[PDB]
């Protein structure tokens, strides 16, 4: 059994973040003004049900800007530039439409828009628009590559957006440069395999042009389709994200990636959830520290699962479950880094009827709504898909973060206190049910009530997701289902008193990315660590090694032996080509000091230590 402990009087502080951020986390890939809200739905006022009742935020949109780019006339004075007058005209037409759409204006308080360009025709590779012209491909001193694309983007933002309501749509919170560019440039079938670093320079040019027209706008990149750092023995890291940080890092306000699990690609299960995405995110942060001297805010503008083996099938509840389980796990992991995550958006769109292909009968694979007669036919009014269960599960969750601990790296836990209510969230990374023994410490009173919410799969493969919601007189034990999530809601007679603090600080090494040779000591240094009287600590070993190679180095911390656990967060990565993941190693707090030496010795040759980082948890008093 796994012991899960909730210390509800102990605030968990990370940087200056102490509270659950619903807009940052409980959101989806939509806008308040898409016309799909307003027709063909069983629920008459769908915004009120989805946005208001469930308290769900938006969003991200690429289609409006694409339509303007693809239809704008060319500047007669400057070949390869959008005409400023026609651009203003098209933007004005759209702005007028927004201004007249008064029913959506009260929902602006739920919206912080991520704007982004689709790859084509924004990337200036010669692709022509519907008006028969291509964005300038020049790369001169006065017209660096992407100048015309950048000017288009900057002018679009300036011309279309207003200050809310009758003044126009509020400005975006964040401007991503370009969606999944290296997928199109390098990796897709029949990709041209043009210059990778040219794309990175393009980001600097775009940022400068956007900020010429819109000085306060945050710009980011590179919006990576598949951040797969270990590939080609870390050659992929060295050619891509390393270079992007080196070239454009100083010019970006935020970094942005996409994170998709592959639960079923030609019958293989290749997950990021668990230790793999920890390694990806640690490598971005660690190298940012080395090169830039700071961690850059990270956006995850799309995440969950891509379901290859089900993507030529019609809709099913099971396909939605594949997405749900990835979303819940990834979300917990992003919550653990809330101080350095600026936005994380599960990839679920509202309706995307544009994505329905009448040739094949295939609807879009990530929708909040589906037609009543699906999967048999794409007919009938729209009703919620199973993805609504995510928003049902997370309903109400807010408040001050408090300390949890669970003694199984495959179980993730978190908790938030909102007055009299406490939300205790537990997620399973294991592929079997896990029996939990629950302890709630820090109050003298029993809860007045307990509501259990449990999201799991019934009936195995091709089964259905179930959201069980029930009241419990007590909850000392609970079986969490395979890859399942529960949210346990405790309600107390009076407001819960939070009277202690646990402050988490994450420290980075002076170096990274070291090759492993058998019996050869690798030495890392983590310095200026601040200790208090009482604390705990975790060393985070990012390892990228072929299968068959040891994940159990000899570890010395300040000359003292520290044991490495057999179990780490998530799966052993069997169907992946190699192992890439962070092994989390608890370390006795008394071994640590301000300047620390971490030594690793492996028994075999090959692979790399990608990163060594450390989390310190400092307590206000002797809370253990
Ligand atoms: O990298 C593996 C690929 O497998 C293919 O079977 C799949 O079609 C392909 O999907 C693509 O993935 C991202 C890049 O472009 C979109 C497309 O669906 C998506 O954003 C990819 O998964
Ligand atoms: O494919 C054209 C449509 O794309 C929609 O947005 C998509 C694209 O960017 C976000 C979202 O998903 C990605 O995979 C991209 O393909 C857009 O909303 C529509 O109006 C069309 O442009
Ligand atoms: Ca990409
Ligand atoms: Ca990559
Ligand atoms: Ca494990």
Numbering used by the authors: 21 to 644
What is written in the article reporting this PDB entry?
determined the three-dimensional structures of these four agarases. initiated by GH86 or GH16B, which generates NAOS. depolymerized by GH86, and systematically saccharified by the exo-acting GH117B and GH2C enzymes. exo-acting β-d-galactosidases, while GH117A and GH117B are α-1,3-L-neoagarooligosaccharide hydrolases.
of the GAL residues in the −1 subsite. with the GAL residue in the −1 subsite was identical. classic CH–π interaction with the GAL residue in this subsite. pocket, at the base of which is a serine residue (S326). residue (T82) in the place of the phenylalanine residue (F77).
